[PDB]
Amino acid sequence: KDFIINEQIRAREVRLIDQNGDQLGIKSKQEALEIAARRNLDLVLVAPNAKPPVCRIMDYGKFRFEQQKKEKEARK
């Protein structure tokens, strides 16, 4: 569920996938953070144990809200 995002990420390099599924390739964490920032989105570590770790560009708050919404609705 919970993913670490943005500056919480410690990986030197990550494989980057953008908000639409475009495979941006291997990028330094710094460049990945720049791309996320220019798009006003978050850099989310979706696959911490992949080699190299996989990050997805997305709005973390919107993603998390929808996930919690889904869980709650299906149980009431």
27: nearest Cα among 40, 11, 7 = 11
Q: Nearest distance from residue 8's CB to ligand PBM, in Å? A: 19
Does 43 sit near Cl ion (CB under 5 A)?
A: no
Residues 17-56 that bind ligand PBM (CB under 6 A): 30-31, 34
CB nearer to ligand PBM: pick between 34 and 71: 34
Instruction: Give the residue, chosen from 14, 42, 45, 58, that forms a contact with Cl ion under the rule CB under 5 A.
Output: 42
Q: Where are the alpha helices (DSSP H) in the chain?
A: 29-38, 60-73
How many CB atoms sit inside 10 A of residue 36's CB? 22
